[PDB]
Amino acid sequence: MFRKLAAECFGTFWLVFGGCGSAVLAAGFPELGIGFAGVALAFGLTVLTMAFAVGHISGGHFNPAVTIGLWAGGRFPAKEVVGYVIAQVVGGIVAAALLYLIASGKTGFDAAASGFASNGYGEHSPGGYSMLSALVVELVLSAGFLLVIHGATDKFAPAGFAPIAIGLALTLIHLISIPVTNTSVNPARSTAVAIFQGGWALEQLWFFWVVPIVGGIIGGLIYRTLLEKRD
């Protein structure tokens, strides 16, 4: 365990630093900016490169909703969960700190006013979507995410392909939901960035813990008590 947690910490740090870093540093860059499609690719790739680099160690969760989701689907032991969830929040926060430091090297930076890539709904939704819209998309996408993780980790097809299926799945998820909640489906990622925004983000933070997790559990039971295995 004194090695599987390091991978957890270093993985969620990569995800935050990369995904959110692309969001605050290059998403809106004038003319040459990467936009949502670029940030969506980044997030997915942080997971794909780390799932290949440290997946054969901790399993490549880098997400509390994924950990607690592998538990519900009956594939990840209990109490080890807490160890992962904490390492995930820490790694994300560290990354968010260095990110904030890097972004501060440019005149006019304002993590409060800009949002600092924080997830939010209603008045804090990128496309101005209602809290209902945020709940539905976040839940469905979260459920589907874990459903793909489970099927891809199943012992009947992948065989080294899981990193690609999971990483691209996260990319797809951002191509859909960024306009709604800016896309979370990962409590560790929402917390890491809400802390530095220190305002409204920290007030809706609770939402991106429950829905992502609930949805994640739903998807774990769906594949468990409805798909494969049987015998």
Next chain:
Amino acid sequence: MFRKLAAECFGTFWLVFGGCGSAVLAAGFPELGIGFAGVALAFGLTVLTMAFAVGHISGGHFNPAVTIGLWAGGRFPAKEVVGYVIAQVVGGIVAAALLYLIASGKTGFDAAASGFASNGYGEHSPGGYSMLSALVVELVLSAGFLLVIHGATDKFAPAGFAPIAIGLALTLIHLISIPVTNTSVNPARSTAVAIFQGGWALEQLWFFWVVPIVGGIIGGLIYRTLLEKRD
């Protein structure tokens, strides 16, 4: 069969929710929108992530044209077809419903006036292309799609790579045909979205059932009676 259909339902739901969701939620977002290239990537990725997650269960069709296409090429039994085709239409429609619900959380939403990512030709073609143009591209692309599916499912090269070849093939198909018909090549996907547009989409719906299917059958016989196997 009480497990292969669930995968069919959950797969076509993923495809619709994701592909069409990106189309109605983020394709045209101001400045940071993903555009056609983004929607094209999304569609392809829904198939790729689900083909890896539930392909080793149902075969990963998520498309009536693909099912009926694997039958013509002589690789998919009869009557089981009907079971798949229905599960595919249901999953798509469910997704279209939740999508409509999510999109409704934003002021000014109008599935009738916006089209709601519906396929269409002539006056309902994105680039204003004639019905002829729609027929040709939809047929050729549909035939090629199934031709790639067959070769990638062949027992002489892939070996776990089929999900990538099929998923990217669908992405490619949207990079070409969105301006023409908004890209269908999947009856289940055209129906799911035409129902909520409830106007012209439901009037041209028939077109995106026959051509996609006919073209799909053409491609299944082309690889069967012209490529590989032999012995």
Next chain:
Amino acid sequence: MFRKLAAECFGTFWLVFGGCGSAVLAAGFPELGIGFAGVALAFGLTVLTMAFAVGHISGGHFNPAVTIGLWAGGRFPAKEVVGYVIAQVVGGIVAAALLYLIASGKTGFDAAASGFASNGYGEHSPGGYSMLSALVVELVLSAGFLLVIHGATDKFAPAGFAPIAIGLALTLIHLISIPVTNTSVNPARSTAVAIFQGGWALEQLWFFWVVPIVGGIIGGLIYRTLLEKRD
């Protein structure tokens, strides 16, 4: 041979129809257009999906420069070359014909004036680059392309990954050279489209036969008499 040629024909048709189709149908679409990055992805993906679908049959060349390049590197028999090169030109031309038909379904279409995705230099170069610039980039990129094909087909690492390495390599090649020559590195692709442009394209056609081929041969000998094998 009465099966390996069909794959050749159907593959180069896919490449032209898809790569050039994205170029003339969606590259410049208003606001939502895919641009060069989109066309570059399309071209690469036509090769990747067909290399997986019909590569375990003909080897997946879909390019005269690749065929004649595998011969120089000492990996592809003679005279069979002519069989491939002809099937490649035919498949490309057929696709170019259907493409022209599809593009004609939209008011204002003009293959002569628009260029119809034709390769060219000097006054017919997208970025207005000199013939020298066209020669260098086309040669280097063509040499590198075949160098990657050879190494990826080598029996010491890939093992089913060749389609990905070759397909993405072609994508990369378009991200660099479209502004220069609109990117050719494939005689079959330049001919298929120059015929319908019927003007200047048919006058510089010769250039995109020799350089692509010469460069292709250079890369085949470089990997042969400088890399791997030895024993």
Next chain:
Amino acid sequence: MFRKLAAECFGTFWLVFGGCGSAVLAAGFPELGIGFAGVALAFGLTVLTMAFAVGHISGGHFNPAVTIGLWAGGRFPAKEVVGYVIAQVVGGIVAAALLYLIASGKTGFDAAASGFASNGYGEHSPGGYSMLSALVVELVLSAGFLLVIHGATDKFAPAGFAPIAIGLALTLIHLISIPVTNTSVNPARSTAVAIFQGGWALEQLWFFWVVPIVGGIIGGLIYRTLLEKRD
């Protein structure tokens, strides 16, 4: 060794010619330009296609920070390092020369004034970021890069997937850091292009040798003395 160096030379040439070529030839092309997301994809793909083509020969470094990084992590012998580092700088410079020649075929070209895709900080940073910001991102990203390389080269999961994990990792790195330093994490790449810019680039060159390397060493020891192996 008289074969592993050729791959080193030809690989770093590919990386420079492709990555930087896309940067100077098509990144800013009017309306249809590929932007940062396009250049980021190019760089990553040069590594991915060459890692598959000549990785089973030299190991696919194409980067002095990667070579010296595999040494610190205890996976790459000494003195052979110097052989690689030199072949890498040469290949990059050759490519930079041909690139400069190609770019010269277009009226108004000015490698001094345009920067010629050179890395830089402060007043020479694309987004105008402080030297501190440049140090942090370059170090972290460099450390993470080698951390992914090590885990992906580990003998417990990849098995032919390393090229994908490493190539996409470099893409991700550019989606984040281009606005800051224009992204280096590769001394050979910074030198190849600074020589032709011949001005400020050659004055900050030292920075993109030390930080990339230091960060690279940090990541090599992190995976070595903190992750996997054990027994």
